[model samples]
Target chain A: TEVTLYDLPTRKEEWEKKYLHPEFLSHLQNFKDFDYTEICNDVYSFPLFTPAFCKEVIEVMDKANLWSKGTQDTQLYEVGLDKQWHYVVFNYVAPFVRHLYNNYKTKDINLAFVVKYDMERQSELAPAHDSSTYTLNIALNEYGKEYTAGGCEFIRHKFIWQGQKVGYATIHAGKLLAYHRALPITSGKRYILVSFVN
Target chain B: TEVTLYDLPTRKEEWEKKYLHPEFLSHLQNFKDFDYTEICNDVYSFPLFTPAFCKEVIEVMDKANLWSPTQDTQLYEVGLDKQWHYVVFNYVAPFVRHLYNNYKTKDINLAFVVKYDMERQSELAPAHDSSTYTLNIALNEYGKEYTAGGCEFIRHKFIWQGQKVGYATIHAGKLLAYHRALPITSGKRYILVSFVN
Candidate 1:
């Protein structure tokens, strides 16, 4: 019963299950569905701040000034099959950067904290797999209220989920397959606090 | 007339009397005290932290009773011959590594903290170091109350002035007694020294 090199997974089915996220194993309803790596549903809940702290941040960003509105930052992304990019992003660093350290628990810390805005009537349309060693994507508000039919999907794994709860973060590994835009937000607005760390 | 190499000693003699520590200039006063090069009476300090940050790190570390004892890391063995030693301060591996990574600095596998005072034999006598490069930081102010104490380089016939708080000194290490701490006449001196390969 001693585990060793001999006990390592050698089959696709074995390694994909063993060498993958424990959360992906929970979703065994469909295994042969996509390409590349998948997701881990048991996302760690990093207490970035209290809900009061969270709500205050959202309200300020929702308003105007240095957010200074219409002003934005740009993000670049490339997915499976080629070195092509099709994504846009912006920074809220000037607005706030208290959580930048993530408690200094991250290995590579630059370019870590950021605000992602998902406007009404449409999804950002393109997303490049973050080129970081690790990433954290937190939903700032309710998904159903903010917008409808919008969620993050893994182009490689062919999996999707827009079920990000308010203040809950979806921590994932960067440098992976493409995640398509939303199915299209028919109403409301969505704001996400997304960041990358090694 | 302009100061010349010929005039330097004359000025140095005049200057040394009014502006420096002899213990600081001892290696040159007697260059044969060892085989290594020494520099002094001209201290150089490498900034290690912002003023606020520097103060806090010291205060926090100074709070603990852990540093109450004196430690020596060597022995001369010449019939109870004991070479001077440093009371080593244990560094958090991750934090130390982060510092080196940012400074693009490499540690030579030796590091620690030490306290040298007037009442104690607070000086390092001539001895070969165990590392390639020795780094030292003044955790507190110098010359404020203390006098006649600092490091030297006998080989170069040079001496660095006493350093200020939060400043650091770095030098090569090898087989020699060219460098050492002079006797103190006043207050205590706290030095955070680390060796790098």
Candidate 2:
């Protein structure tokens, strides 16, 4: 199910109302008090976009039909979003993240891209640290329905996050603590939005 | 020991040459590589202004001779000359923004110098700023200017110590964490603060 030009939101407000989760949208209004779960020493998880939104994102990538090889040995590939889409997503997420981290200073998203993992292409990603203050990964598909045997491992921290819930976000420090990698998928395809913020 | 009107920099260029630390100024040119020490969880410290700049700030505040009592602290409003304010928006703000890779253009809503004196029983209680980020510069030497005064975080169970004249410590302005100015036991302590948007 790939998206076409007709599927894209005409305005930012439309995107928010249509794609964003109701709980997440409401939380942003009073984000100062929104309670979140800490996955590990510094990693945190929270609800973000809706399942519809996640599905649309994957569909949009599929429609774009462009991917850059992430590695030669593996089938890992990634593609950056259009500037308009990048601007839209960044502006909304920045404020929420700033409030959540108590780093209330607004920062621009230095990089935003989609990573694709499949049984045929890439099933898992090798360990590497992102070069930024923090990194965010938003699952675009569910665990059982869309894929199986997929998760993430914070190697040094000895914490494995199995949150493949559609539209859930896993965020952690990027530079200071960098040992994290994706786990292998046994079946189906996986799509995730990866953003680096500083 | 107070600055006269003649001691202040009349222009921005003069201000940078006469006051700013050469090392600090040079670091700003290539700030991406300027190493910073994390005093505690999420709290970072680095060199900024010079000793002379710090001394002049204290002198300027004294010369103004007006202090407003807020909570347990005494604060002096900094509505001085253009060059005086230039040092903040022009130098400090942009540099700090680069340090954290923050590129938002929110003007400084407030700029002032705070005085904490043991004699007056003045000290700031634990609280967060309303702005996006809080930038504070040590306007006096730690051991020489005052004693037992710095910033302490309740959540991290850590104290910044706030040593090094002209050095700056920055953190999230509206952090859920609680931080207070350490009590002064001996002399007086001064800090130049700005609520960066």
Candidate 3:
């Protein structure tokens, strides 16, 4: 039987109760000496980019995967391990762009994008854990030539018992129904995501 | 009363049991790989040159000492900590003339003398806790030169207790008195000897 993406719901409520709110409040109250603005800024900035910024930002994100011969030809995407719907701009993008500027010319120009979620908002949504698929649609402007690329986003959702991500993502954009693959489920464990850029 | 050097006897039998024979012969016998002859040879060949060889030897040893500043300048006559004796020897006239053809004029000199005594020997001739002076008399081709160099030999000696003639000759010219300080029954356990050229 094929694993459906809808079967996994991001367990946002449990994560917020267990980690986010407690950690945030404790640091905000007890750590008065610390730079509260910077600390709080990071939490609010979780999965920092938006879907609107994905087009221009994807190139920057993909720069991390650009240098590698293996990942140079594929697209890049990231999902929060938590059940948050916040967009996470890959941190490696800026460094990758600087490295390309210093060493290699524009040899492999590929786009990169990320999907982040707010731990607080994700907890509120309490997305379902159904084995379902979602689609992602991207409109690219290459030298003023516009084109649309759409595909079924595979959300291999699961709940990690011991690891960081206890919840999963909701199937969102394009052609998600076309892919019949079931979303894989985990017993609330942590997962690592590796992406490539084309 | 003063303790005269002549009052001491030097021989294997007169020495204490610790110095005379192996304390644990059974344990030593188990170590079949140990070369008894080589060990004895090392003991006999310890002080290779006459006092004249000191200057030349010091020059060669100085290189290593210069590289590592921590090396003590004094020619350690006895290392109670390591249970060894370390000396530098440079081939000089009369000391190595009979042994080598070009002993006097050899410029590319090479020799570092290190004498390691077994644990048994050191335990027998225990080091004196009190400080004592060490006088090194140099006997060259000319005559005996008395110079108080900045070096101190350990006061402890391996005395063949009561053995009258504790003398060992190296290369038939230089002699070492294998006598420890006599326990206070006779006199103060220290004396100076003249090294005749």
Best by lDDT: 2
Candidate with the greatest TM-score versus the true structure: 2
* First chain TM-score for all predictions: 0.51, 0.81, 0.21
RMSD (Å) of each candidate, 1 decimal:
21.5, 9.6, 29.9
Model 2: residues with Cα > 4 Å off, grouped in runs = A1-37, A40-43, A46-144, A147-163, A166-198, B1-10, B32-35, B69-78, B119-124
Q: In model 2, what are the clashing residue pairs, if there are any?
A: none
Q: Write down the TM-score of every candidate.
A: 0.30, 0.55, 0.14
lDDT of 3 by residue, A1-198 (tens): 322111123443333333232333234333333221211100101121123233433444444443333112233423212212121212222222223122111122233334221121222222222221112122222211221121122222222111111121121211111122222222221111222221
DockQ of 2: 0.11
B1-197: candidate 3 lDDT, tens digit per residue: 43221112332122222221232122232333322222121122112223323343334344544321111223223221111111111112332232222123212111123211121111224121111111122212111221111111121122222211112222111111122222222211111121111
Model 2 error, position B38 (Å): 2.3
In candidate 2, how many Å is residue B169 off? 0.9
Candidate 2, true inter-chain contacts retained? 0.18
Model 2 over residues B1-197: C-alpha lDDT tens digits? 44432444545456666677776677766777776787876567888777777776677678767766342222324445444456666676676556554434356766777877755654465676755567788888778768887888765788778578878887756533457777878888888777755
Interface RMSD of each: 21.6, 7.5, 43.9
Per-residue error for B133 in candidate 1, Å, reads 0.8
